[PDB]
């Protein structure tokens, strides 16, 4: 099964995707 | 504010000015029709957009035209 | 946002440093009491029939939050209520969380502020940055080894706590 | 000019009158002269009795004032009415009739605003004026 | 469930704190001049 | 003998002077409420209003909440009332942020500094009143059963 560390890695990748999504939203907003 | 245009098919019957509840239109001198007058819209900041002038116009497809645009306090008919 | 002291400002760095010094203190004192057995009924599973559906965690055995975790959370709830009241109704002398639009930003201290020992803002900022860096280091040492955070603190302090 | 000291028609008051935006954004005034004391319907709901002589009334909207003007024109043969706009700063802007002559009658000096020199079927399609600040009229 | 504390931590946060801050900041943004 | 008159001697404003709206009792009660009473700072208006509303906020949560038949009913009700108080304080904060421009005037409610003082007072009063209600229900068995303890 999945461990705690794997879920934490997925959360870190999702936070990176959040930062990239915020940057794309700021770029689209001019 | 709404935009009101008067096209040169106007026959100067003065019905649109009499139908206006907000005093937006008025009759000015002109040479394009037998009546010698054409409608004009100098006061479109008071235009609510009710299109009573368009209902009043007797020329086949209308000579006076109201284009609804940006809404203001006057154009929204707000007493508040 | 940035005009009120929020974001990357010196005020926000100072506030997070203060909260991080308090976090280092709270983790050390939690480790000390948890090693020494000062939490009453630490393995007691809270029952849904008393505390409602918020006590459900859905683990494999007991299906309830432990009493120790609830005590730690309530201890944090106390200082969160203190936090809310201080954020909305600060003391007249106290440093405020949000600043007025026409405020004067504190100058950035650079690599290191001037070495003013005592109850000076420079020493406060130095230990605040130190505490944030220590929290980062403790988290990384905890997640790269599998050692629990209380146990990681006890190992890094040489088994002084327990 | 608007004489602020003109007496008002006798009204018992109503809930239909002007709101805070009249004293904050803009307010409207209508004056008229009656040959006798007579009962008229308020444009905000209710009956008031206008006095013999001059009458000044305050409204929230221009359309309410012009509705009252049309009512007294077709029911009491009163055509001397004047409608003004009043701001909170106290500047009074005369509105109706703008040049003293009613807008349905031609008066010299009036210039045409918004007149188009072709029929409405000669307006442009949007595809000529997309990505361009040219008007659809030409 | 491995890491069973995470639903009980995140569901109240995502369902009450995230929409409250989003509505507050969006309100501040759309009503400011 | 007419009891209903035009408001403020203006017949064309959108209000009427009625016995319910403009009698001596109504004017005295409104002028003696903390929101209108003269000589009060906005902070003390907030303190009184928050004390009253936060004090009465405890009751429905304690008596009708999902934990009402448990031994921790009062604690849960007070905590729920405190959460509602925090939500309303956030509402006050965003209202004051979006409603007022930053002015020197701070002795009126409808100013930025005055509304911030009013919000601070309302929070402190609400916490104090909720805690007082918690103390009173905790320490008086009459309030715990809402009067069935007499039977
Ligand atoms: C998870 C632990 C934790 C906690 C309890 C805090 C606590 C705090 N942070 Mg914070 N922070 C953290 C981790 C944490 N930080 C981390 C890991 C980062 C990234 C490096 C930041 C970056 C950060 C910034 C950039 C700011 C804060 C601010 C704040 C303060 C107000 C909270 C806020 O943002 O508005 C309330 C938040 C919600 C209601 C949600 C408060 C003292 C702000 C501050 O101090 O402004 C004066 C601010 O501007 N923090
Ligand atoms: C590194 C530790 C440290 C230092 C040097 C300071 C220093 C300062 N803080 Mg501070 N603070 C700290 C930790 C620290 N704080 C922590 C951990 C918290 C969170 C609980 C706070 C929360 C806090 C608030 C909310 C406020 C301050 C404020 C202040 C300033 C005014 C003095 C005051 O009222 O003290 C307040 C001090 C505390 C609340 C706790 C600190 C207690 C220290 C660590 C005791 C150390 C004594 C020790 C024996 C050394 C003695 C040296 C000797 C020469 C006397 C001052 C620059 C105020 C400010 O900036 O106003 C403009 C203010 O409003 N602090
Ligand atoms: C155990 C963790 C730890 C660590 C690594 C540090 C490290 C440091 N602290 Mg700090 N501090 C700590 C805990 C810690 N502190 C605690 C728990 C308190 C509250 C009592 C303080 C209160 C404090 C103050 C008030 C000051 C420092 C200062 C300093 C700096 C030393 C320079 C100096 O003149 O020393 C002087 C050291 C002291 C007067 C007391 C230090 C006490 C700790 C326990 C020693 C740790 C080493 C250094 C970065 C000073 C500084 O940054 O000067 C600009 C300074 O003025 N600290
Ligand atoms: C808060 C202050 C503090 C205190 C009082 C101690 C105290 C101690 N540490 Mg320690 N340590 C600290 C901070 C601290 N450490 C920090 C911030 C780290 C980095 C994460 C470490 C990393 C560390 C390691 C890796 C080891 C110790 C060890 C030790 C013990 C014997 C060696 C010694 O004298 O330390 C000298 C001081 C230091 C090593 C750092 C200061 C001693 C009880 C040793 C031990 O026996 O632990 C099991 C050991 O192997 N420490
Ligand atoms: C769009 C995809 C999606 C959806 C609908 C859900 C739905 C749910 N997740 Mg989940 N999750 C996702 C992706 C998603 N997940 C991913 C990619 C991860 C890995 C990081 C997780 C990790 C995760 C955990 C660890 C937990 C949940 C939980 C939950 C439940 C409660 C909501 C919550 O707390 O969210 C929390 C979710 C996050 C903090 C991660 C953010 C989700 C992704 C990364 C963002 C997707 C946004 C989308 C593309 C854009 C939307 C725009 C607009 C419509 C708002 C709910 C069933 C909780 C649960 O089990 O409750 C029963 C819980 O504890 N999720
Ligand atoms: C997905 C979002 C979400 C979540 C996580 C919850 C969670 C909960 N709801 Mg619920 N609710 C929701 C959406 C949600 N609701 C919606 C959309 C509605 C409208 C139909 C309701 C209507 C509703 C009612 C009518 C009731 C609940 C109740 C409850 C609680 C269950 C009983 C219990 O044991 O608590 C015991 C209660 C507590 C422990 C009090 C919690 C107080 C919190 C922690 C304070 C936090 C305040 C605030 C979030 C701080 C940040 C402010 C910021 C957002 C601006 C539980 C906390 C019941 C309850 O007990 O509430 C009093 C209840 O009566 N809910
Ligand atoms: C209006 C319809 C209605 C009513 C009366 C109730 C009533 C109740 N619900 Mg329910 N509910 C409803 C609709 C309703 N529900 C809907 C539509 C949903 C979503 C589908 C829910 C979902 C829901 C959940 C999930 C839960 C409840 C719960 C509750 C109980 C406690 C709620 C609570 O804490 O209130 C708090 C109330 C207040 C803080 C204030 C009440 C209003 C005051 C009394 C008004 C006073 C006005 C006053 C006279 C003015 C005087 C001014 C001046 C003259 C002095 C209670 C029996 C909880 C429970 O235990 O279930 C039984 C629970 O967990 N409800
Ligand atoms: C430790 C933990 C918390 C704490 C939190 C604190 C505030 C942790 C600090 C988070 C801070 C903000 C870390 C700073 C990171 C700066 C960037 C990432 C890096 C440069 C390299 C709190 C205060 C809730 C108390 C809790 O009982 C223990
Ligand atoms: C819709 C539209 C809006 C505008 C933009 C747009 C692009 C045009 C589009 C948005 C779109 C889509 C793309 C938006 C979807 C977006 C993203 C993916 C949302 C993900 C959020 C993840 C949460 C915050 C974090 C978990 C990490 C936490 C902080 C970690 C803890 C960590 C773990 C425990 C391990 C230890 C270390 C620490 C660090 C402690
Ligand atoms: C609030 C509370 C109320 C009353 C009681 C009280 C005690 C007065 C108070 C508590 C208060 C506060 C004051 C207590 C909080 C206190 C202090 C600030 C604790 C600081 C800890 C920092 C340590 C863990 C780390 C250093 C990081 C190491 C790993 C590494 C650095 C290295 C690594 C490899 C990474 C690269 C950098 C280099 C340098 C090369
Ligand atoms: C009944 C009557 C019949 C029918 C008609 C009617 C008129 C509608 C009706 C009237 C009805 C309604 C309107 C009744 C009116 C009701 C309101 C709800 C009464 C509120 C009282 C609050 C008092 C007890 C407390 C203050 C808290 C004390 C000072 C604090 C101690 C705290 C302070 C901060 C200091 C620290 C310690 C702590 C404990 C934290
Ligand atoms: S739409 Fe109404 S207000 Fe506007 S000009 Fe036509 S009749 Fe007058
Ligand atoms: S109603 Fe039509 S035809 Fe008559 S004057 Fe007005 S625009 Fe011309």
PDB file of N, CA and C in Angstrom, chain D residues 65-132:
ATOM      1  N   UNK D  65     -40.597  63.533 -12.481  1.00  0.00           N
ATOM      2  CA  UNK D  65     -40.935  64.932 -12.730  1.00  0.00           C
ATOM      3  C   UNK D  65     -41.628  65.109 -14.075  1.00  0.00           C
ATOM      4  N   UNK D  66     -41.131  64.438 -15.115  1.00  0.00           N
ATOM      5  CA  UNK D  66     -41.746  64.587 -16.431  1.00  0.00           C
ATOM      6  C   UNK D  66     -43.092  63.877 -16.516  1.00  0.00           C
ATOM      7  N   UNK D  67     -43.281  62.799 -15.748  1.00  0.00           N
ATOM      8  CA  UNK D  67     -44.595  62.175 -15.634  1.00  0.00           C
ATOM      9  C   UNK D  67     -45.593  63.111 -14.966  1.00  0.00           C
ATOM     10  N   UNK D  68     -45.168  63.798 -13.897  1.00  0.00           N
ATOM     11  CA  UNK D  68     -46.027  64.805 -13.276  1.00  0.00           C
ATOM     12  C   UNK D  68     -46.332  65.950 -14.236  1.00  0.00           C
ATOM     13  N   UNK D  69     -45.334  66.363 -15.023  1.00  0.00           N
ATOM     14  CA  UNK D  69     -45.532  67.424 -16.006  1.00  0.00           C
ATOM     15  C   UNK D  69     -46.545  67.020 -17.070  1.00  0.00           C
ATOM     16  N   UNK D  70     -46.452  65.780 -17.560  1.00  0.00           N
ATOM     17  CA  UNK D  70     -47.419  65.277 -18.532  1.00  0.00           C
ATOM     18  C   UNK D  70     -48.814  65.176 -17.921  1.00  0.00           C
ATOM     19  N   UNK D  71     -48.892  64.746 -16.655  1.00  0.00           N
ATOM     20  CA  UNK D  71     -50.177  64.643 -15.967  1.00  0.00           C
ATOM     21  C   UNK D  71     -50.847  66.004 -15.812  1.00  0.00           C
ATOM     22  N   UNK D  72     -50.095  67.013 -15.356  1.00  0.00           N
ATOM     23  CA  UNK D  72     -50.691  68.336 -15.195  1.00  0.00           C
ATOM     24  C   UNK D  72     -50.927  69.016 -16.538  1.00  0.00           C
ATOM     25  N   UNK D  73     -50.218  68.596 -17.591  1.00  0.00           N
ATOM     26  CA  UNK D  73     -50.433  69.154 -18.919  1.00  0.00           C
ATOM     27  C   UNK D  73     -51.726  68.629 -19.530  1.00  0.00           C
ATOM     28  N   UNK D  74     -51.994  67.336 -19.374  1.00  0.00           N
ATOM     29  CA  UNK D  74     -53.182  66.740 -19.966  1.00  0.00           C
ATOM     30  C   UNK D  74     -54.399  66.777 -19.049  1.00  0.00           C
ATOM     31  N   UNK D  75     -54.233  67.087 -17.759  1.00  0.00           N
ATOM     32  CA  UNK D  75     -55.372  67.160 -16.856  1.00  0.00           C
ATOM     33  C   UNK D  75     -55.679  68.558 -16.335  1.00  0.00           C
ATOM     34  N   UNK D  76     -54.708  69.478 -16.318  1.00  0.00           N
ATOM     35  CA  UNK D  76     -54.952  70.818 -15.806  1.00  0.00           C
ATOM     36  C   UNK D  76     -54.557  71.926 -16.773  1.00  0.00           C
ATOM     37  N   UNK D  77     -54.098  71.581 -17.984  1.00  0.00           N
ATOM     38  CA  UNK D  77     -53.655  72.531 -19.016  1.00  0.00           C
ATOM     39  C   UNK D  77     -52.571  73.477 -18.499  1.00  0.00           C
ATOM     40  N   UNK D  78     -51.592  72.921 -17.792  1.00  0.00           N
ATOM     41  CA  UNK D  78     -50.463  73.680 -17.264  1.00  0.00           C
ATOM     42  C   UNK D  78     -49.236  73.325 -18.094  1.00  0.00           C
ATOM     43  N   UNK D  79     -48.679  74.319 -18.790  1.00  0.00           N
ATOM     44  CA  UNK D  79     -47.523  74.112 -19.654  1.00  0.00           C
ATOM     45  C   UNK D  79     -46.296  74.921 -19.253  1.00  0.00           C
ATOM     46  N   UNK D  80     -46.387  75.767 -18.229  1.00  0.00           N
ATOM     47  CA  UNK D  80     -45.285  76.630 -17.821  1.00  0.00           C
ATOM     48  C   UNK D  80     -44.295  75.954 -16.871  1.00  0.00           C
ATOM     49  N   UNK D  81     -44.413  74.640 -16.672  1.00  0.00           N
ATOM     50  CA  UNK D  81     -43.578  73.916 -15.721  1.00  0.00           C
ATOM     51  C   UNK D  81     -42.107  73.927 -16.132  1.00  0.00           C
ATOM     52  N   UNK D  82     -41.232  73.940 -15.125  1.00  0.00           N
ATOM     53  CA  UNK D  82     -39.789  73.913 -15.316  1.00  0.00           C
ATOM     54  C   UNK D  82     -39.173  72.847 -14.419  1.00  0.00           C
ATOM     55  N   UNK D  83     -38.263  72.059 -14.989  1.00  0.00           N
ATOM     56  CA  UNK D  83     -37.601  70.960 -14.295  1.00  0.00           C
ATOM     57  C   UNK D  83     -36.108  71.259 -14.232  1.00  0.00           C
ATOM     58  N   UNK D  84     -35.546  71.167 -13.024  1.00  0.00           N
ATOM     59  CA  UNK D  84     -34.146  71.437 -12.727  1.00  0.00           C
ATOM     60  C   UNK D  84     -33.498  70.219 -12.078  1.00  0.00           C
ATOM     61  N   UNK D  85     -32.178  70.121 -12.221  1.00  0.00           N
ATOM     62  CA  UNK D  85     -31.365  69.135 -11.519  1.00  0.00           C
ATOM     63  C   UNK D  85     -30.522  69.834 -10.460  1.00  0.00           C
ATOM     64  N   UNK D  86     -30.536  69.304  -9.237  1.00  0.00           N
ATOM     65  CA  UNK D  86     -29.829  69.885  -8.102  1.00  0.00           C
ATOM     66  C   UNK D  86     -28.838  68.857  -7.579  1.00  0.00           C
ATOM     67  N   UNK D  87     -27.603  69.285  -7.380  1.00  0.00           N
ATOM     68  CA  UNK D  87     -26.538  68.477  -6.817  1.00  0.00           C
ATOM     69  C   UNK D  87     -26.374  68.786  -5.334  1.00  0.00           C
ATOM     70  N   UNK D  88     -25.734  67.889  -4.566  1.00  0.00           N
ATOM     71  CA  UNK D  88     -25.455  68.197  -3.148  1.00  0.00           C
ATOM     72  C   UNK D  88     -24.605  69.437  -2.924  1.00  0.00           C
ATOM     73  N   UNK D  89     -23.729  69.790  -3.868  1.00  0.00           N
ATOM     74  CA  UNK D  89     -22.941  71.012  -3.752  1.00  0.00           C
ATOM     75  C   UNK D  89     -23.778  72.280  -3.889  1.00  0.00           C
ATOM     76  N   UNK D  90     -25.010  72.177  -4.388  1.00  0.00           N
ATOM     77  CA  UNK D  90     -25.895  73.314  -4.525  1.00  0.00           C
ATOM     78  C   UNK D  90     -25.990  73.888  -5.921  1.00  0.00           C
ATOM     79  N   UNK D  91     -25.225  73.362  -6.874  1.00  0.00           N
ATOM     80  CA  UNK D  91     -25.342  73.798  -8.259  1.00  0.00           C
ATOM     81  C   UNK D  91     -26.651  73.295  -8.856  1.00  0.00           C
ATOM     82  N   UNK D  92     -27.411  74.203  -9.461  1.00  0.00           N
ATOM     83  CA  UNK D  92     -28.706  73.888 -10.054  1.00  0.00           C
ATOM     84  C   UNK D  92     -28.547  73.907 -11.568  1.00  0.00           C
ATOM     85  N   UNK D  93     -28.919  72.806 -12.219  1.00  0.00           N
ATOM     86  CA  UNK D  93     -28.828  72.675 -13.669  1.00  0.00           C
ATOM     87  C   UNK D  93     -30.243  72.598 -14.232  1.00  0.00           C
ATOM     88  N   UNK D  94     -30.618  73.609 -15.011  1.00  0.00           N
ATOM     89  CA  UNK D  94     -31.927  73.642 -15.648  1.00  0.00           C
ATOM     90  C   UNK D  94     -32.011  72.572 -16.732  1.00  0.00           C
ATOM     91  N   UNK D  95     -33.104  71.810 -16.733  1.00  0.00           N
ATOM     92  CA  UNK D  95     -33.247  70.670 -17.632  1.00  0.00           C
ATOM     93  C   UNK D  95     -34.365  70.841 -18.647  1.00  0.00           C
ATOM     94  N   UNK D  96     -35.575  71.193 -18.208  1.00  0.00           N
ATOM     95  CA  UNK D  96     -36.721  71.153 -19.120  1.00  0.00           C
ATOM     96  C   UNK D  96     -37.671  72.330 -18.917  1.00  0.00           C
ATOM     97  N   UNK D  97     -38.100  73.012 -19.995  1.00  0.00           N
ATOM     98  CA  UNK D  97     -37.615  72.933 -21.380  1.00  0.00           C
ATOM     99  C   UNK D  97     -36.245  73.596 -21.533  1.00  0.00           C
ATOM    100  N   UNK D  98     -35.331  72.932 -22.252  1.00  0.00           N
ATOM    101  CA  UNK D  98     -33.912  73.287 -22.206  1.00  0.00           C
ATOM    102  C   UNK D  98     -33.648  74.681 -22.766  1.00  0.00           C
ATOM    103  N   UNK D  99     -34.250  75.014 -23.907  1.00  0.00           N
ATOM    104  CA  UNK D  99     -34.106  76.340 -24.495  1.00  0.00           C
ATOM    105  C   UNK D  99     -35.370  77.185 -24.358  1.00  0.00           C
ATOM    106  N   UNK D 100     -36.267  76.823 -23.439  1.00  0.00           N
ATOM    107  CA  UNK D 100     -37.512  77.532 -23.246  1.00  0.00           C
ATOM    108  C   UNK D 100     -38.648  77.070 -24.133  1.00  0.00           C
ATOM    109  N   UNK D 101     -38.337  76.489 -25.285  1.00  0.00           N
ATOM    110  CA  UNK D 101     -39.315  75.937 -26.214  1.00  0.00           C
ATOM    111  C   UNK D 101     -39.337  74.428 -26.024  1.00  0.00           C
ATOM    112  N   UNK D 102     -40.539  73.848 -26.014  1.00  0.00           N
ATOM    113  CA  UNK D 102     -40.696  72.418 -25.796  1.00  0.00           C
ATOM    114  C   UNK D 102     -40.019  71.626 -26.918  1.00  0.00           C
ATOM    115  N   UNK D 103     -39.466  70.445 -26.603  1.00  0.00           N
ATOM    116  CA  UNK D 103     -38.657  69.715 -27.597  1.00  0.00           C
ATOM    117  C   UNK D 103     -39.424  69.230 -28.819  1.00  0.00           C
ATOM    118  N   UNK D 104     -40.749  69.093 -28.747  1.00  0.00           N
ATOM    119  CA  UNK D 104     -41.515  68.708 -29.925  1.00  0.00           C
ATOM    120  C   UNK D 104     -41.725  69.856 -30.906  1.00  0.00           C
ATOM    121  N   UNK D 105     -41.343  71.079 -30.546  1.00  0.00           N
ATOM    122  CA  UNK D 105     -41.436  72.231 -31.431  1.00  0.00           C
ATOM    123  C   UNK D 105     -40.038  72.655 -31.863  1.00  0.00           C
ATOM    124  N   UNK D 106     -39.889  72.965 -33.152  1.00  0.00           N
ATOM    125  CA  UNK D 106     -38.596  73.380 -33.685  1.00  0.00           C
ATOM    126  C   UNK D 106     -38.241  74.774 -33.183  1.00  0.00           C
ATOM    127  N   UNK D 107     -37.005  74.928 -32.716  1.00  0.00           N
ATOM    128  CA  UNK D 107     -36.465  76.213 -32.296  1.00  0.00           C
ATOM    129  C   UNK D 107     -35.125  76.443 -32.977  1.00  0.00           C
ATOM    130  N   UNK D 108     -34.863  77.695 -33.346  1.00  0.00           N
ATOM    131  CA  UNK D 108     -33.594  78.049 -33.965  1.00  0.00           C
ATOM    132  C   UNK D 108     -32.451  77.940 -32.961  1.00  0.00           C
ATOM    133  N   UNK D 109     -31.278  77.562 -33.466  1.00  0.00           N
ATOM    134  CA  UNK D 109     -30.103  77.368 -32.647  1.00  0.00           C
ATOM    135  C   UNK D 109     -29.866  75.941 -32.201  1.00  0.00           C
ATOM    136  N   UNK D 110     -30.879  75.082 -32.282  1.00  0.00           N
ATOM    137  CA  UNK D 110     -30.710  73.673 -31.953  1.00  0.00           C
ATOM    138  C   UNK D 110     -29.878  72.971 -33.021  1.00  0.00           C
ATOM    139  N   UNK D 111     -28.923  72.153 -32.583  1.00  0.00           N
ATOM    140  CA  UNK D 111     -28.049  71.397 -33.472  1.00  0.00           C
ATOM    141  C   UNK D 111     -28.372  69.917 -33.308  1.00  0.00           C
ATOM    142  N   UNK D 112     -28.327  69.175 -34.413  1.00  0.00           N
ATOM    143  CA  UNK D 112     -28.633  67.757 -34.387  1.00  0.00           C
ATOM    144  C   UNK D 112     -27.518  66.895 -33.832  1.00  0.00           C
ATOM    145  N   UNK D 113     -27.831  66.096 -32.816  1.00  0.00           N
ATOM    146  CA  UNK D 113     -26.877  65.190 -32.185  1.00  0.00           C
ATOM    147  C   UNK D 113     -27.309  63.760 -32.476  1.00  0.00           C
ATOM    148  N   UNK D 114     -26.377  62.948 -32.971  1.00  0.00           N
ATOM    149  CA  UNK D 114     -26.666  61.561 -33.272  1.00  0.00           C
ATOM    150  C   UNK D 114     -27.358  61.310 -34.592  1.00  0.00           C
ATOM    151  N   UNK D 115     -27.373  62.287 -35.495  1.00  0.00           N
ATOM    152  CA  UNK D 115     -28.015  62.118 -36.791  1.00  0.00           C
ATOM    153  C   UNK D 115     -27.093  61.368 -37.744  1.00  0.00           C
ATOM    154  N   UNK D 116     -27.653  60.397 -38.461  1.00  0.00           N
ATOM    155  CA  UNK D 116     -26.915  59.570 -39.407  1.00  0.00           C
ATOM    156  C   UNK D 116     -27.419  59.896 -40.807  1.00  0.00           C
ATOM    157  N   UNK D 117     -26.491  60.027 -41.756  1.00  0.00           N
ATOM    158  CA  UNK D 117     -26.798  60.511 -43.096  1.00  0.00           C
ATOM    159  C   UNK D 117     -27.147  59.392 -44.076  1.00  0.00           C
ATOM    160  N   UNK D 118     -27.590  58.238 -43.582  1.00  0.00           N
ATOM    161  CA  UNK D 118     -28.083  57.176 -44.447  1.00  0.00           C
ATOM    162  C   UNK D 118     -29.157  56.404 -43.697  1.00  0.00           C
ATOM    163  N   UNK D 119     -29.838  55.516 -44.419  1.00  0.00           N
ATOM    164  CA  UNK D 119     -30.842  54.663 -43.802  1.00  0.00           C
ATOM    165  C   UNK D 119     -30.180  53.612 -42.912  1.00  0.00           C
ATOM    166  N   UNK D 120     -30.993  53.014 -42.035  1.00  0.00           N
ATOM    167  CA  UNK D 120     -30.490  52.045 -41.067  1.00  0.00           C
ATOM    168  C   UNK D 120     -29.991  50.761 -41.732  1.00  0.00           C
ATOM    169  N   UNK D 121     -30.494  50.421 -42.922  1.00  0.00           N
ATOM    170  CA  UNK D 121     -30.010  49.251 -43.638  1.00  0.00           C
ATOM    171  C   UNK D 121     -28.638  49.405 -44.263  1.00  0.00           C
ATOM    172  N   UNK D 122     -28.049  50.598 -44.206  1.00  0.00           N
ATOM    173  CA  UNK D 122     -26.708  50.836 -44.718  1.00  0.00           C
ATOM    174  C   UNK D 122     -25.654  50.825 -43.622  1.00  0.00           C
ATOM    175  N   UNK D 123     -25.987  50.317 -42.438  1.00  0.00           N
ATOM    176  CA  UNK D 123     -24.986  50.164 -41.395  1.00  0.00           C
ATOM    177  C   UNK D 123     -24.020  49.042 -41.756  1.00  0.00           C
ATOM    178  N   UNK D 124     -22.811  49.128 -41.213  1.00  0.00           N
ATOM    179  CA  UNK D 124     -21.778  48.158 -41.533  1.00  0.00           C
ATOM    180  C   UNK D 124     -22.002  46.847 -40.788  1.00  0.00           C
ATOM    181  N   UNK D 125     -21.511  45.765 -41.384  1.00  0.00           N
ATOM    182  CA  UNK D 125     -21.429  44.498 -40.682  1.00  0.00           C
ATOM    183  C   UNK D 125     -20.304  44.567 -39.648  1.00  0.00           C
ATOM    184  N   UNK D 126     -20.416  43.808 -38.550  1.00  0.00           N
ATOM    185  CA  UNK D 126     -19.333  43.790 -37.545  1.00  0.00           C
ATOM    186  C   UNK D 126     -17.976  43.342 -38.076  1.00  0.00           C
ATOM    187  N   UNK D 127     -17.937  42.531 -39.140  1.00  0.00           N
ATOM    188  CA  UNK D 127     -16.670  41.987 -39.621  1.00  0.00           C
ATOM    189  C   UNK D 127     -15.763  43.053 -40.233  1.00  0.00           C
ATOM    190  N   UNK D 128     -16.326  44.141 -40.774  1.00  0.00           N
ATOM    191  CA  UNK D 128     -15.480  45.270 -41.164  1.00  0.00           C
ATOM    192  C   UNK D 128     -14.851  45.956 -39.958  1.00  0.00           C
ATOM    193  N   UNK D 129     -15.565  46.023 -38.838  1.00  0.00           N
ATOM    194  CA  UNK D 129     -15.157  46.855 -37.716  1.00  0.00           C
ATOM    195  C   UNK D 129     -14.665  46.028 -36.539  1.00  0.00           C
ATOM    196  N   UNK D 130     -14.453  44.729 -36.724  1.00  0.00           N
ATOM    197  CA  UNK D 130     -13.762  43.962 -35.700  1.00  0.00           C
ATOM    198  C   UNK D 130     -12.284  44.324 -35.714  1.00  0.00           C
ATOM    199  N   UNK D 131     -11.689  44.385 -34.514  1.00  0.00           N
ATOM    200  CA  UNK D 131     -10.295  44.801 -34.297  1.00  0.00           C
ATOM    201  C   UNK D 131     -10.015  46.175 -34.908  1.00  0.00           C
ATOM    202  N   UNK D 132     -10.985  47.084 -34.795  1.00  0.00           N
ATOM    203  CA  UNK D 132     -10.930  48.403 -35.412  1.00  0.00           C
ATOM    204  C   UNK D 132     -11.939  49.284 -34.682  1.00  0.00           C
TER     205      UNK D 132
END
